[PDB]
Each structure stands twice: as C-alpha cells, then as structure tokens.
Amino acid sequence: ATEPLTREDLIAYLASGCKSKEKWRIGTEHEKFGFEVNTLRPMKYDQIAELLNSIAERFEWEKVMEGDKIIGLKQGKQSISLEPGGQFELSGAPLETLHQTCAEVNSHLYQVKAVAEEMGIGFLGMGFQPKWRREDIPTMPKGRYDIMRNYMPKVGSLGLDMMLRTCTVQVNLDFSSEADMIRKFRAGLALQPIATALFANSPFTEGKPNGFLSMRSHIWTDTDKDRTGMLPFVFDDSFGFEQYVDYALDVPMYFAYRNGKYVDCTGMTFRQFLAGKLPCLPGELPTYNDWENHLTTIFPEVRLKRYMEMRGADGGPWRRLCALPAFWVGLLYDEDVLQSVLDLTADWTPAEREMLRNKVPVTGLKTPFRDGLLKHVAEDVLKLAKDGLERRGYKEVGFLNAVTEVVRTGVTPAENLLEMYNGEWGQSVDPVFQELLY
Amino acid sequence: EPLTREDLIAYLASGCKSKEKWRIGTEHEKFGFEVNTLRPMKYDQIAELLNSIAERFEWEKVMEGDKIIGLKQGKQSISLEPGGQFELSGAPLETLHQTCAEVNSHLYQVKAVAEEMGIGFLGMGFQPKWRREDIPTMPKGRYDIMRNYMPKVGSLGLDMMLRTCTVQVNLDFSSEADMIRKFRAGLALQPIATALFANSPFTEGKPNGFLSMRSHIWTDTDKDRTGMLPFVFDDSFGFEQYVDYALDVPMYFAYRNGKYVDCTGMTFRQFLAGKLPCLPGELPTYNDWENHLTTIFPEVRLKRYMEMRGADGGPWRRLCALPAFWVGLLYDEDVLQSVLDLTADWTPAEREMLRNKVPVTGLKTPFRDGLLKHVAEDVLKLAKDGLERRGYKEVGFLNAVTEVVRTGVTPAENLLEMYNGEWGQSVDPVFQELLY
Ligand SMILES: CCCC[S@@](=N)(=O)CC[C@H](N)C(=O)O
Numbered sequence: 121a122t123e124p125l126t127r128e129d130l131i132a133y134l135a136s137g138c139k140s141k142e143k144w145r146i147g148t149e150h151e152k153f154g155f156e157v158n159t160l161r162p163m164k165y166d167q168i169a170e171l172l173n174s175i176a177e178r179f180e181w182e183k184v185m186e187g188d189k190i191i192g193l194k195q196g197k198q199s200i201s202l203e204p205g206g207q208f209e210l211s212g213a214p215l216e217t218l219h220q221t222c223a224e225v226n227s228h229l230y231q232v233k234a235v236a237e238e239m240g241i242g243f244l245g246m247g248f249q250p251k252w253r254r255e256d257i258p259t260m261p262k263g264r265y266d267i268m269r270n271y272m273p274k275v276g277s278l279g280l281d282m283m284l285r286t287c288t289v290q291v292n293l294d295f296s297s298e299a300d301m302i303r304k305f306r307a308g309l310a311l312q313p314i315a316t317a318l319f320a321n322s323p324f325t326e327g328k329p330n331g332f333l334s335m336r337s338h339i340w341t342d343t344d345k346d347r348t349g350m351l352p353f354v355f356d357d358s359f360g361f362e363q364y365v366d367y368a369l370d371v372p373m374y375f376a377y378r379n380g381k382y383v384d385c386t387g388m389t390f391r392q393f394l395a396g397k398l399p400c401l402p403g404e405l406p407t408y409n410d411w412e413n414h415l416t417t418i419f420p421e422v423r424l425k426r427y428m429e430m431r432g433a434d435g436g437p438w439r440r441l442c443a444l445p446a447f448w449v450g451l452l453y454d455e456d457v458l459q460s461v462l463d464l465t466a467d468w469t470p471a472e473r474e475m476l477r478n479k480v481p482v483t484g485l486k487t488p489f490r491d492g493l494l495k496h497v498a499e500d501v502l503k504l505a506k507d508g509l510e511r512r513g514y515k516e517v518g519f520l521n522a523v524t525e526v527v528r529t530g531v532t533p534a535e536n537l538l539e540m541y542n543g544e545w546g547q548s549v550d551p552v553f554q555e556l557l558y
Numbered sequence: 559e560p561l562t563r564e565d566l567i568a569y570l571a572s573g574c575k576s577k578e579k580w581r582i583g584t585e586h587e588k589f590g591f592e593v594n595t596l597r598p599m600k601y602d603q604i605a606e607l608l609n610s611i612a613e614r615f616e617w618e619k620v621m622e623g624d625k626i627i628g629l630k631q632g633k634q635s636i637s638l639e640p641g642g643q644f645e646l647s648g649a650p651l652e653t654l655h656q657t658c659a660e661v662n663s664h665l666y667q668v669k670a671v672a673e674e675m676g677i678g679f680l681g682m683g684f685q686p687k688w689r690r691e692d693i694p695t696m697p698k699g700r701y702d703i704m705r706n707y708m709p710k711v712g713s714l715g716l717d718m719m720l721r722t723c724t725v726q727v728n729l730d731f732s733s734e735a736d737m738i739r740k741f742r743a744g745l746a747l748q749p750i751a752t753a754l755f756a757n758s759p760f761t762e763g764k765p766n767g768f769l770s771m772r773s774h775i776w777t778d779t780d781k782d783r784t785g786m787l788p789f790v791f792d793d794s795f796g797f798e799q800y801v802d803y804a805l806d807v808p809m810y811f812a813y814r815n816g817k818y819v820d821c822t823g824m825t826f827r828q829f830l831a832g833k834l835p836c837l838p839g840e841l842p843t844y845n846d847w848e849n850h851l852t853t854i855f856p857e858v859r860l861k862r863y864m865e866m867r868g869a870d871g872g873p874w875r876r877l878c879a880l881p882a883f884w885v886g887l888l889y890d891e892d893v894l895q896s897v898l899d900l901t902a903d904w905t906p907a908e909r910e911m912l913r914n915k916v917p918v919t920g921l922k923t924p925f926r927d928g929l930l931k932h933v934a935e936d937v938l939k940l941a942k943d944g945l946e947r948r949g950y951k952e953v954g955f956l957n958a959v960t961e962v963v964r965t966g967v968t969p970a971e972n973l974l975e976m977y978n979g980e981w982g983q984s985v986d987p988v989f990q991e992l993l994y
Pocket residue numbers: 151203204247282283286287288336419
C-alpha cells in the first residue's frame with residue numbers, strides 16, 4: 121500500500137526507540153584484523169569465506185549472502201559481518217549485564233579461533249593495521265563498499281584508510297525519553313575524547329611509529345566533514361529528535377537498496393528521496409528501512425538512531441572489549457552519575473571539545489586541558505563510572521580494571537606498545553601480532 | 559506392581575536408541591586451589607563460587623539442606639566430588655564441536671568468578687602436592703557414608719574420593735547386540751585410553767613412580783565394584799547378566815525423606831524383596847535402581863547409556879580429545895568391527911595385565927611381541943577414520959593425543975621431564991603449567 125513518509129514520521133521513528141529503564145540493554149560491536157600467522161599477511165576473502173562457512177556449520181549460524189558471496193552470519197540477535205578491508209566484526213545481542221557481554225565476546229573468540237587455528241589464521245586487536253599499506257589490503261566483494269570507495273577521495277584524504285585499515289569497539293545504549301536522550305548525547309559527546317584516550321591503540325603505520333597514539337581517531341578527522349565529528353548543535357537549546365532528523369536529512373546519501381542491489385546515490389540527499397526526486401531512483405519514495413540505512417551512513421563521535429552509539433574507541437584485546445561497554449554503562453545508566461558528568465562538562469566550550477577531539481589522537485591523557493591534563497578529568501570520570509557500576513548491583517565494576525592503570529599512570533595502551541617497539545621488539549612491529557593476538 | 563528383576567533389565571534396555579538419536583555426554587572434574595598458597599579450595603570458597611556462577615550466568619542452585627552443593631542449567635550440571643573437585647556434567651550433544659564449546663563456556667564462567675577470588679583450577683588426574691588429610695571434605699551425606707565404608711574394602715578408596723580427577727564420556731547404544739559390542743570394545747581398549755591420558759605422576763610433591771597413580775588407585779578401592787568385568791566377554795553376556803552383577807554389588811545407601819540412609823553391607827536383592835535392614839519393608843523405585851547403578855565403578859559402566867571411565871583429568875585440549883577418541887571408535891560401525899577384530903583373541907589375563915601394568919609403564923607396557931604403543935598406533939588411526947566418516951570435520955580433536963601415540967611418551971612423562979629439569983624438582987610449577 122502507498123502511504124508516503126513525512127519528516128514527522130522520520131522523527132517518530134527515532135523517538136520510537138524510547139524505552140523504560142528496566143528494558144535498557146547493552147549492545148556491543150567490535151572489529152578485528154585477521155592475518156596469516158606465518159607471513160602476517162592480511163586475511164583474503166577466500167580465507168574469510170571458508171572461515172564463515174565453517175563457523176556456520178559447526179556453531180549453527182545462518183549464512184548472509186550478497187549474490188553468490190557469503191559476507192556474514194546471523195544467529196538470533198547476533199551478527200558477524202565484514203568491514204571493507206576484511207575486518208571481522210561481531211555485533212552482539214542486546215544484553216542486560218556486562219557479565220553476559222563478556223561471555224558473548226568470549227564465545228565469539230572461541231568459535232573464531234576454533235576454526236582459524238586449523239587455517240593458520242590469527243586475529244589482531246588494534247585500532248589501525250600496523251604493518252601493511254592501503255594497497256596491500258584485500259577488498260570485500262560488497263557493492264555498498266564499492267560505492268563508498270569511489271566517493272571517499274572526493275570528500276577527504278583518509279576515508280579509504282578508515283574503511284580498509286581501522287578497527288573499533290563500540291557500545292549501543294538505550295534512552296527513555298527525548299530529555300534522557302539529549303542528556304546522554306551531550307555526556308557521550310563531551311566524554312568521547314576521554315574514551316578515545318583510554319583506549320588509544322594505533323601508534324604504528326607501515327611498520328613504524330606514525331607520531332600518533334590513535335591514528336584511527338585522527339583518520340576520522342579527514343574522512344568526510346559532512347558526516348563526522350563532535351556535533352556542536354547537540355549542545356544547542358533547540359536540540360531534540362527533530363534537530364537530529366534535519367541534520368541527517370541534509371547529510372548526503374551513499375546508496376539506496378533496490379532489487380537486490382545498491383544504487384549509487386552519492387551527492388544526493390534523503391530530502392530529495394522523501395519528495396521522490398532522487399536522480400538515482402526517480403519517482404521512488406523511501407521506506408523506514410531506507411531511513412535506517414541512511415542513518416547508518418552517518419559517522420559522528422556519538423551517533424543517534426533508535427538507540428545511541430559510542431564510536432570513539434580503538435579496537436583492542438579482550439579485556440578492553442569488555443571494558444568499553446562497562447565504561448559507558450557506568451556513566452550513562454546511573455542517573456546521578458549522568459548528572460555528575462553533565463555538571464563536570466557543563467562549562468566546556470564548543471572550541472574546547474573540538475580541541476580535545478583533535479589533540480587527543482596525538483597526546484592522549486597528557487593532552488593539556490585548562491590548568492592541568494586530560495588525565496585529571498579521566499581520574500574523575502573513571503571514579504564516577506565505577507560508582508555507576510557499583511550501584512547497578514550486578515558486581516560489574518571489575519570490568520574497569522583494564523583501564524584503571526591507564527588512568528592511574530596517564531600512559532595509554534598505544535604508549536605501552538611504543539615502549540616495546542623501542543625496547544624489547546627491536547623496532548619491528550612484528551611482535552605485536554603475538555602481543556595483541558586473540 | 560512392585561519392581562521385579564525383569565523390570566530392572568527393561569530399565570537398562572530402555573536406553574536403546576536409533577543411531578540418528580545418539581549423543582555425546584562429557585563429564586570432567588578439576589582441582590580448585592588458591593593461586594598464592596596452592597592450597598586446596600575449601601567449601602566456603604566453593605559456596606561463594608557456585609553462588610556467583612548461579613547469579614551471573616543463570617544457573618539453578620542445588621542444595622543439600624542449607625548448603626549449596628551444585629548447579630543445574632538445562633541438561634548441564636555442576637557438582638562437587640568428595641574433596642571439592644569441581645565437576646561439569648554436560649548436555650547430550652550431537653558433535654564434538656559443540657562438546658568443546660561447552661567445555662570452553664564452563665571454563666570461562668568458572669574463571670570469570672574464580673579470578674577475583676584468587677582461585678585457580680588444575681587439570682590433572684591426582685592431586686600432586688597435598689596429603690589426604692589436607693583435603694577439605696564436602697558437606698554431603700552420601701560421601702560421609704562412603705568415607706566410612708572405604709577403609710573396610712581397600713586402602714586407596716579414600717584417595718579415589720578426595721584426590722583424583724577424571725574426564726569421562728557417555729555414549730548410546732541401539733540394541734542389546736550393539737551394547738555388547740561397544741562394552742567389549744570399551745573394556746578391551748580402556749587401558750589404551752588410560753595410557754594416552756596418563757597425567758598423575760606426583761604425590762605429595764614428589765614422583766610417585768607411576769604415570770597414572772589415579773588408575774592404580776582404582777585397583778585398591780573396592781574389588782566388588784571395579785575392574786575389567788571379564789564376564790562381559792562371556793557368550794552369556796547381555797542386559798540380564800549385567801543386572802545380576804549389579805544386584806550382587808553391595809549397596810552404599812538409599813535416599814528417603816531428604817537424606818541418605820546407610821545401606822552398606824546390604825544388597826539390592828534384599829531391597830527388591832522389602833528386606834533391607836536400613837529401610838525395612840520398603841520396596842525400590844527406578845530412581846533407587848539408578849542410584850545403585852551409579853555406585854558401581856568399573857573401567858566401563860552400563861546404565862541406560864555407556865560410560866568410559868579410564869582417563870585422567872587434563873588440560874582443555876585433552877578434555878575435548880577424550881570424547882573424540884571414543885566417538886571415533888564406537889560410533890562408526892566399521893571401526894567398531896575393526897576394534898573387535900583387533901582385540902578378538904586377547905585373553906582375560908592379557909586384558910587384566912594391561913589394566914594393572916599401564917599405570918606404571920603406559921604405552922611402553924610390553925604386549926605380546928611389542929609394546930602397547932603399537933596397538934595404540936592402530937587404534938588412533940581407526941579413531942581418526944571414524945571421525946572423518948562422521949562428516950562433521952571433528953578429526954582435529956585427536957591432534958592432542960597424536961604426539962603421545964607417535965613418540966610413545968605420555969603427558970605424565972612430560973611433566974616428569976619438567977620436574978627433573980626446568981622445575982628444579984618442585985611440583986609447584988605444575989599449578990601454572992596445567993592451570994585452566
Ligand atoms: C564501512 C564504514 C562504516 C562502518 S563503521 N562506522 O562501523 C567502521 C568503523 C571503523 N572500522 C572504525 O575503526 O571506527
């Protein structure tokens with residue numbers, strides 16, 4: 121039946137994510153670099169397809185196909201997918217506690233290694249591929265990524281590196297109202313540079329130090345200015361679901377999915393789409409699934425759909441995969457901690473937030489901020505996050521042990537790798553493929 | 559109608575299932591210890607561990623009185639052995655991929671709680687450091703009855719109870735004929751499994767002169783309920799003959815009114831007639847019969863399924879190998895025949911000798927004009943054939959025993975080599991080496 125969507129419907133779609141506190145869940149996604157253990161070469165698509173087929177067969181996953189190509193797996197509310205450079209991704213189910221989150225991570229790592237060991241394949245938990253050049257990375261046989269690869273050079277010089285050479289750990293979290301959403305969004309944006317610093321894990325490029333602690337985070341500043349960043353309008357009095365929808369309506373599209381394929385709609389807006397005026401699909405009107413797809417092509421430091429996504433942290437070893445969601449659950453899921461965070465960050469200017477975002481990639485917790493170091497803010501933030509987890513009552517506070525020494529010493533994971541590179545590793549990155557081996 | 563002997567025979571036979579319904583059930587036990595002192599984990603620490611696991615990972619609590627003694631989730635159980643050994647009895651699973659993932663899930667949950675408590679778990683067949691009197695005892699009425707009985711029937715049964723760990727597998731049969739064949743293959747080959755998995759060379763911080771002290775212990779526990787069951791190889795053998803055997807094995811206890819009554823020195827035959835002094839006039843249920851069948855401890859046991867009992871506890875890759883070994887041998891009809899062919903002319907005296915000698919000499923046990931190693935070479939290739947033919951790509955689960963069979967050197971001998979070299983003649987490093 122033909123019943124066109126309006127902007128008002130798009131607003132209501134986001135708002136439809138509201139849920140009461142007792143239904144709030146924790147969704148965790150992470151990406152990993154696969155490599156051949158003996159050559160350290162990136163895992164190619166033929167090896168990826170064997171890995172996926174074996175996982176499906178052994179562990180009962182449904183195969184996700186694009187044409188005649190396996191590109192992912194599905195089992196209940198979990199998915200395994202591929203990033204543009206073959207980075208191997210788990211999107212976990214919405215879970216109630218971080219004990220469940222970490223068991224989900226462990227189950228995945230067991231299944232992957234159970235198959236990959238016989239194949240001579242290992243997985244690396246870092247934010248940026250430390251050894252190989254961009255043109256050494258295999259590309260995935262996915263139509264949507266072909267469109268994106270062709271567009272990236274038009275809007276930045278590092279977007280192809282984002283696609284091919286970066287890995288993240290992220291957390292998805294729920295809101296209960298527009299007021300709650302706004303508060304969470306503001307807390308999440310303001311504190312995102314702190315997450316980035318604590319999880320900074322990408323100091324190598326092409327076998328050498330790149331001069332950054334999170335090269336991955338820097339990459340996101342020269343990807344696409346239209347769909348990235350610290351979203352200053354979120355801190356405007358006017359902000360709400362409607363202001364986010366207008367933002368998103370004017371972010372240019374990548375594609376529209378019709379008839380089993382991705383149509384290139386670059387340079388066009390979802391506005392045009394709503395009015396049936398897309399030159400890629402002329403006269404065609406969008407569905408809620410089109411809107412959801414479009415929403416998934418926007419890449420700010422925190423993203424809004426029917427839930428909220430914290431996107432600032434580098435991939436890392438398993439204890440840090442469990443720490444990242446713990447960090448945000450502690451801060452955002454306790455009302456008093458959330459208020460404390462808003463209080464702490466209340467007087468930070470847009471230029472200050474933007475400065476932290478840009479400088480943290482280089483200096484981490486030693487980034488100057490006001491009359492001290494970001495480290496001192498991270499101290500306060502970490503104690504607050506542990507307060508939040510204590511009060512949840514589920515005994516989850518131990519999941520923050522993995523970042524306690526970072527905060528305490530002010531020394532990022534990336535600086536620990538640098539120290540090994542310059543010492544015991546004899547200035548080769550090759551030992552990182554054992555050090556950060558899953 | 560009171561149960562009769564014919565009902566007891568039919569109980570066992572009711573386990574028969576068609577090949578498409580055959581499953582794999584895996585149980586293993588681990589020693590818990592304090593990481594810093596190496597001391598055995600005490601009941602108060604076990605109770606905290608079980609309560610935390612239940613709460614985090616959604617397990618139902620199993621209580622004896624006001625004491626938590628285990629957990630239940632679906633068809634899986636976690637229980638305690640008499641010395642606090644921490645046991646998983648897994649679900650009936652279709653493939654060994656599922657088996658090993660089951661093992662991994664358990665190890666993760668246990669370690670997720672135990673790390674914060676300063677507790678580790680050791681995968682060995684015999685407690686390598688501590689004396690019998692050093693081992694905490696579990697607050698479980700059935701084990702109190704057993705502890706009091708053991709000294710009457712052997713000198714090492716208390717060590718069985720307090721200081722041993724096993725990995726075992728439960729498997730199904732489709733008919734009486736199939737049960738008989740699997741029982742015979744299981745019993746004949748059990749000393750080979752014992753040698754491959756031999757992992758108990760230390761007692762009280764020193765070499766004890768064995769490769770599997772655990773296996774040896776089972777030779778001086780109780781002669782009435784252990785061993786290689788030679789009657790299984792008689793022409794007469796079937797469900798009926800096993801029932802008679804079990805009816806004549808003395809009882810341990812009967813469970814009534816929320817407790818265990820001491821029925822030692824009494825027989826299930828008396829029970830059937832209502833003449834058990836411990837429960838006078840009472841007649842048995844099928845649950846009573848099950849409980850009784852669970853107090854019989856031969857190298858292979860029969861209930862409504864079959865249980866392979868010969869292998870020492872070990873690290874995780876060997877927990878996955880033990881079920882694979884028997885699945886390869888018993889769940890392929892051609893391999894099963896090839897095993898019965900290979901063992902056809904073994905005498906009762908030969909089988910008995912191998913069972914008693916393997917604990918000392920392992921795969922270097924002399925057998926006829928060579929070594930048990932040479933038989934294990936043939937048996938391993940056959941077990942791999944069976945797994946290849948299953949079509950589930952499970953053969954890799956035997957990689958963990960391939961070098962043992964190749965070199966003829968048991969895991970226990972590898973530990974001894976470390977003890978005599980890098981460890982500097984202390985067992986304390988084994989608590990890192992075989993740490994889960
Ligand atoms: C293909 C680009 C969109 C997918 S993403 N936003 O999940 C990529 C995350 C990137 N690999 C990172 O490390 O942030």
